[model samples]
Each structure stands twice: as C-alpha cells, then as structure tokens.
Target: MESSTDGQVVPQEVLNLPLEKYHEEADDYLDHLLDSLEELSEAHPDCIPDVELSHGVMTLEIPAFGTYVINKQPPNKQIWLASPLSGPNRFDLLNGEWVSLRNGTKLTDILTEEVEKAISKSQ
Candidate 1:
C-alpha cells in the first residue's frame, strides 16, 4: 500500500474476508509465518500484545500502549507492529506498570521486519 505524500496516518478498513477465505488465501504462504508469531508470543512474555476488533473498533494493546479507534481505512499489507497508534502512547499493564514507545517510526521498518520474519520461517 502506498502512503500519501503528506505522511498522515491513513486509516484502514477491517479485513472483510471470511475466516475460511482468509485461511485459504493466506495459508499456503502464511502458515509458517502465523506459526512463528504464535511461538514468539509465547517466548516474548514481556511484550504483552493484544488485538481485538468489534463493531468497527479495533483495539490494539501492546507493550507500550493500548489504543482504540474506529473508521480507519488502512490499506492492505500495511500497518503492522509499528502501525501508528490510534490513541495515547502509554497504557497500564496487567502488573500495574506503564510504558510508552514512540509512534513515529516509519511503518516500513515494522512491516519489513514482519515480512522478513515470514521469509525466515518459510525458508
């Protein structure tokens, strides 16, 4: 997805693909990639990332923040781990701690890592 020249955080639409369709479309290339994320989730206990979507609201809770938003039309294959935070950069953790990570890192860095991860696992 190409970003606008203005560098504004363009919103995105939720994936409308049916679960089965999503699986079918991505499974061949994404299977190992998905498995690696699962494994990393288990190993990286301190990261504490959570993603939830309902009624046009997608809530993403990460190590540094918990953000909420609606009506974003982010393009496909964009907005991965370092996607612009929709809300504040700080959030309370389960253990009652707070942290914040910068939201300004280019989304490309984040997405590149994700793609690299997929390649690593698939290879």
Candidate 2:
C-alpha cells in the first residue's frame, strides 16, 4: 500500500492504542529480528558486518549495500522496514503476525529472505 502523507489513512484506534501495548508489540518483533541477526552472525561471522539497535530501531549493514533499517511506529501501530533493495515496507499486525499490507508477506520471512540475499550478494 502507498504511504499516506496527511496521516488521514491511519485508523483512529491505532493512533490511540495504549502506549504500553504499542511498545510491547514493537519490542517483541524488534527482538525477534535482532535474534535472527544474532543467528546470522554466529553462522557467518565475516559475512554479516555490523548491526545497531537504539531505542525502537534496528540497523543492519551489508558490505556492498546500504543499511537495512527496521523501526517501530507506535503512533501508526506498525513496523516499518527500509530495504536497500526494495525501498520501504510498512507492516501491520494481522492476526498474530506482522504483515505487509502491500504484499501479504510476513515480516520475519521477508527479513530472512532479504538478509540472506544481501549476504550472498556481498560474497
């Protein structure tokens, strides 16, 4: 789905979701992403270069590509990922999974595929 500029497209309830619930959801998924990064690092220490997590965002660096940024958007009640390959993807919670409204892809699955591709490309 296309990004909205006026913030008119976001649901009112999402904007008003309890702050603690927002943080809980975002942190949970962010931690999962970080855990995947940890697995990759352990598997190929020289392939995955570096990573940084600050507050509600995580950044991953690939050797020949720009950083991959994944961050929590509490106000919008979504997770946003900036890819070196595919630009930006905003995800919403669908059922119990974080999903892309544009393509119906699950967040962790997309991240896993993208990271693997970047690692292979760098090598």
Candidate 3:
C-alpha cells in the first residue's frame, strides 16, 4: 500500500533533485553558513575556537561549549546537524530553506540560538 504520508514530508519540487543541483545548493548554503560563523567568531573573539569545512562537512568548535558538525547527506538529499547542545537533527530543503518537518524548525534558527547561548556563557 502506497501511503501519501509514509515517507518523510518533503516538498514535491525538491524530491529526487539531481545530484548536481543538490551539490550546488548544498555547497552554497554551507559556504554561506561558514562565512556567518566566521563573522560571529570575529565579532566576538575567543568564543569560537575554529570553524572548518572539509569534504562536505562543516565543523564549528567552541571551547566553552562544544563542537557542532553539519554535513551533507547526498543519498538522503538532506542536511544533517549534530550539535553539542541539541543532539542531532536532519533538515530537508523546503521553500528555499533548510527545515525540519518533524518540529517545523529552521536549521539556521537553531544554530543562531545555540551560538548565542554559547557566546553568552563565554562572556
């Protein structure tokens, strides 16, 4: 039996997106996120120890807090996050944003909140 809701809730437009398009969008988003993190670190020094992107995975290190791992899941066509503060969550491209349908949470929002909390604790 094929149920409409059996699979993960994803926008029809993005389902089965080509691998090339996925790579382009994923890389662009991650690159922009990396830049934002770098800016945050620069704006408030010593809070973020390091930020690096390698082989489609981004690692954000905060000495006072912990490490955050954000990576691309090509097979699943999703972005996955492993956060020290919130454990793990996966995001699917929806409406040009990375969002989790399970909780209706945007990926950037979570990162922003976690980063702010970490910065506050460092201060």
Candidate 4:
C-alpha cells in the first residue's frame, strides 16, 4: 500500500527549487502571460470577454466557450491550469518553459490553440 496520502510524485527539480525563486519565476511568467492575454482580449473582444490576474490566479472568460483558471501551486512548485477545452493540468518549470510532464505539452501552446479556436468560432 502506498504510504503517502497524496500519491503524487514531485520531481526532484521542483523540490530543489527555492520557494523564493519559484515565486519570482512564476510571477514573471504569469505577468507576461497576462499581457499577451490582454492583447488577445482587445483583438477579439467578442470571443474573450474578460482577462484578469489577481492574488496569483489568472482568469480568462471566453463567451460561449468557458472560463480558464491558471494559478500557482506553491507547495508543489508547479503551475496549474484549468482549461475549458482540455480540463485540468499541472505544469512544471523545465527548460525555461512551463510544461506538463505527463503529456509533454507546453502551457502557452495550449492557451494559444484554444484561444485561436475561440476567435475563429467568433468570426
């Protein structure tokens, strides 16, 4: 029987990262992401109804699509995304990119693809 309550295996890299460094990198990434999202929202206001970042959580409201929630998971030292199109995923900072270990998918790529689909549908 598994002794651990969570049953989640955290990577050594994530474990080794200092909490302060994680905060710095995660915040920087989220800020940059927010900027890009804001531009996307401005360009396709009909598809993207709202974009907001507060309290380490970023929310994107896509009309007729759904909401996307992205936040920092400090204890896990990871980024979690609740995507309307793809469900939930956890991403770790690897090679200067936020990536899912299970699927090898980049966080930004997922967002870009889904947002593009929304924009096209709106057009």
TM-score of 1: 0.28
Whose TM-score is greatest here?
3
The global Cα lDDT (0 to 1) of model 3 is: 0.73
Per-residue C-alpha lDDT of model 3 across residues 1-123, encoded as one tens digit per residue: 134333334565465555455666887888887777777777874744787877777777777677777887557667788796657668888857788885598888887787788668666
lDDT of 4 by residue, 63-116 (tens): 767878788755766688878665766887785678987658888888778767
Scanning candidate 1 in windows of ten residues, the lowest lDDT window is 90-99
Pairs clashing within candidate 2 = none
lDDT: which is higher, 1 or 4? Answer: 4
Which residue ranges in model 1 land beyond 4 Å of their true spot? Answer: 1-25, 51-61, 65-110, 113-123
How far in Å is the alpha carbon of 1 misplaced in model 3? 50
- Which candidate model has the greater TM-score, 3 or 4? 3
Return the TM-score for each candidate structure. Answer: 0.28, 0.65, 0.70, 0.69
Model 4 score (lDDT):
0.72
Relative to the true structure, candidate 4 reaches a TM of 0.69
Model 1, 1-123: lDDT tens digits are 135333223333234434343323333223333344445546672366554443222344445433322222234322223233543222211121122233344322444464456435555
lDDT of 1 at 112: 49
Cα lDDT computed for each candidate against the true fold? 0.35, 0.69, 0.73, 0.72
